[PDB]
C-alpha cells in the first residue's frame, strides 16, 4: 500500500514497476471519480421528480436544491487538493468515495416520507456537494503518479471519464425509477461500496484570475446547464418528460471536452476559446427565439460549446504556465526538461483553485433561473444576464490575449 520509492521521471523505474502501479491506480481512480459526479448532480434528476411523489416546493425551491451541491462543491475543492499529500491517494480515494454513501441513503429515505421538511432536503444537497470536490483530489493524485510528460493523457482520461458521471446518472436514474424515487439514490450504494473496497486494496499511497473566469464561463456553464436544464425544460414544456432526453446533453458536453484540447493544440488555445465564446453568445441568444426541437438543439449546442470551452481553457492554462517556466528557466539558464516538469507541476498545483472558481457557476446558473422565474414569469431575465456575461467573456478574451 505505501510507496517509499517513486521515480516516474526515471524510464528504467517506469518500465520496471512505475507504469504497472500508475496504471492500476488510474483504472481505479477513474470509476471512483465518475461515481462522485453521479452523486454530485443528483438533484438535477431528483428535484424534478420531487413534486410527482407529493412535495409542495416552489419551482425555485427546487432550483435551489439543484444549485447548492455546487456551493459546498466549490468551497471544498481547494481544501480537497491539499488532502492527497497529507493522507495519501489510497486513503483519501477510499474515504472520499465511501462517505458519499451517507447522502445517497438519506435522500433515498427522505423521498418516501411525504412530510419531510425543506430544511432536511437542503442538508442533503450540501452533502451531495462533497462529491463535487472529489475531482480536485483525484486529479492531484493522478498528477503524482504520472511523469510530468505523460500526465496529459492520464489527466485527460481521468477528468474526461470523470465529467461523464452526470451524463451517466441522467441515463440511469430515470430508467431505474420504475422497478420509485429511492432508486435514483439507492442504485449507487452498491457501486460506491464496491469501489471504496477497490481503492482501499488496489490503490497506493505515495510518501491568473482571468483564467479562473474563463473556466467559469466554460465549465461552470456545463455544470450549470447540467443541473438547471431538466428543471427548466419542465417549467417551459410541462407536456414533455425531459428526463428521458436530458442525459444526452451532459454526454455531448463531456465528450466535447476531450476534443476541445485536441482542437486547440491544432489551431490555437486563445483562438478556439475566442471563437467558441462567439457561439456561446449566439446560442445564448437563439434561445430567446424558442420560448421544442429547436429549444433542445440550441441547448444541445450550449452543452457542446461548454465542452470545447473547458477543454480549450485547460490547454490555454497549460500553455500559459509552459511559456512562463520556459522564460524563468532560460534566465536561470537550465534545461527544457526542468521547464517542462515545472510547468506541469504549476498547472497541477493551480488546478485546485481554478476548478473551485469554475465550480461556482453550477450554483449561479440554476439559482439565476430560479430567481428570474420567481420574480418575473420568464427565464428571459437571467437568460439576458447570460448573454451579457458571454459577451463580457468574449471581450475579455480578445482584449487580454488576441
Amino acid at each position, epitope marked *: 500500500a505505501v*510507496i517509499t*520509492d517513486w*521515480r516516474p521521471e526515471d524510464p*528504467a523505474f517506469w518500465q*520496471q*514497476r512505475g507504469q504497472r502501479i500508475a496504471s492500476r491506480n488510474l483504472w481505479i481512480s477513474v470509476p471512483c471519480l465518475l461515481l462522485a459526479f453521479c452523486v454530485w448532480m443528483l438533484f438535477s434528476a431528483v428535484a424534478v421528480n420531487l413534486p410527482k411523489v407529493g412535495f409542495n416546493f416552489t419551482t425555485d425551491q427546487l432550483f435551489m436544491l439543484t444549485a447548492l451541491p455546487s456551493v459546498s462543491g466549490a468551497l471544498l475543492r481547494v481544501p480537497y487538493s491539499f488532502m492527497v499529500p497529507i493522507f495519501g491517494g489510497r486513503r483519501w480515494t477510499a474515504f472520499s468515495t465511501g462517505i458519499l454513501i451517507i447522502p445517497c441513503v438519506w435522500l433515498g429515505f427522505a423521498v418516501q416520507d411525504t412530510s419531510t421538511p425543506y430544511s432536511v432536503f437542503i442538508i442533503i444537497s450540501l452533502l451531495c456537494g462533497f462529491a463535487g470536490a472529489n475531482f480536485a483530489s483525484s486529479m492531484a493524485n493522478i498528477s503524482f503518479f504520472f511523469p510530468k510528460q505523460k500526465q496529459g493523457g492520464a489527466l485527460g482520461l481521468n477528468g474526461g471519464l470523470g465529467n461523464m458521471g452526470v451524463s451517466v446518472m441522467q441515463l440511469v436514474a430515470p430508467l431505474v425509477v420504475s422497478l420509485y424515487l429511492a432508486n435514483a439514490s439507492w442504485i449507487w450504494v452498491p457501486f460506491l461500496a464496491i469501489f471504496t473496497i477497490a481503492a482501499w486494496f488496489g490503490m497506493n499511497d505515495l510518501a491568473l484570475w482571468i483564467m479562473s473566469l474563463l473556466y467559469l464561463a466554460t465549465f461552470g456553464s456545463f455544470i450549470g446547464f447540467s443541473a438547471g436544464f431538466a428543471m427548466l425544460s419542465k417549467t417551459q414544456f410541462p407536456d414533455v418528460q425531459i428526463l428521458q432526453y436530458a442525459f444526452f446533453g451532459p454526454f455531448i458536453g463531456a465528450l466535447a471536452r476531450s476534443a476541445g484540447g485536441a482542437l486547440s493544440d491544432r489551431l490555437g488555445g486563445t483562438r478556439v476559446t475566442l471563437v467558441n465564446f462567439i457561439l456561446m453568445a449566439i446560442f445564448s441568444g437563439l434561445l430567446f427565439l424558442t420560448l421544442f426541437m429547436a429549444f433542445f438543439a440550441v441547448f444541445l449546442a450550449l452543452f457542446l460549446t461548454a465542452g470545447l470551452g473547458s477543454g480549450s481553457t485547460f490547454q490555454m492554462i497549460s500553455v500559459i504556465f509552459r511559456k512562463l517556466t520556459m522564460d524563468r528557466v532560460k534566465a536561470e539558464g537550465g534545461s527544457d526538461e526542468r521547464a517542462m516538469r515545472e510547468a506541469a507541476t504549476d498547472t497541477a498545483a493551480a488546478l485546485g483553485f481554478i476548478s473551485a472558481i469554475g465550480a461556482i457557476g453550477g450554483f449561479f446558473i440554476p439559482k439565476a433561473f430560479g430567481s428570474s422565474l420567481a420574480l418575473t414569469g420568464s427565464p428571459v431575465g437571467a437568460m439576458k444576464v447570460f448573454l451579457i456575461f458571454y459577451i463580457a467573456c468574449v471581450v475579455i478574451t480578445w482584449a487580454v490575449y488576441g
Partner: antibody
Amino acid sequence: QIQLVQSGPGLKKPGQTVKISCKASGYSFTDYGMNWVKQAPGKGLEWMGWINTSNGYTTYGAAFKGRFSFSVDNSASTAYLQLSNLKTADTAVYFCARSWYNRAMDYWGQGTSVTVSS
Amino acid sequence: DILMTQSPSSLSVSVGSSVTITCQASQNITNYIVWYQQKPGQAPKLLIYYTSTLESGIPSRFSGSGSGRDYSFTISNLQPEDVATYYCLQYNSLLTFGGGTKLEIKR
C-alpha cells in the same frame, strides 16, 4: 513462498567462462529487478549491477564493465550471471537478490561459490 | 559514485547491550538506505528499508534513522542470534554497500 535458488559451486581456470543462474519463484518474475552481488573471500559485499526484468536491459556498476553479462530467461523465470576471461580476482561467492527499488534486495539467493584456479 | 563509510568495522558487545552502527554517505541519498544482516554461509537478510521501516518478521529490537548524508542503525537488546556482519546500503543513485560491521557477543 518467495525464494531464489542459485546454482551450485564451480571451479574454473583463468581464461575460462562461467555462468551462474538464479531461479525465482512464489512471485511474478517480471515485476521486480534482479541485483547481482559479489563477495570475495574475507572482503565485504559489492554490488555489480542489476537487470530490468521487463526490459531485459542490464546496468553495470563501474568495476563490472567489460567481462560481465546479466541475461534473463522470463519463461524459466530465472536470471543469469556470465563472467568470461576469468581471473584469480573473480573468486567469490555470488549473489542474486531481488529489487532495485522499493525494498532493495529484499530476498537473496543462497549464493554460489566460484573458484578460479589452475 | 556515492561512497559509504560505515562505523565501526567491528565490535564485541555484552548480551542485552545496545549496538549503534553509523553510516555516512558522500552525498545526500534522500532517505534511501537499507540495512542487511549477514550470518556466514547463509545469505543476507534485509532488516530495514527507507531508513526506518522494518521488513515484516524482523523483531522490534532493530531500528534505524537518519537523513541527507548521515544514517544510523541500532540493535537494542542484544541476543546471541544477532551475531553476524551488518551492512548499510545506498540505493539512491546506483547501489553502494558499506564496508560491514562484524558484531561479536561477549560472554
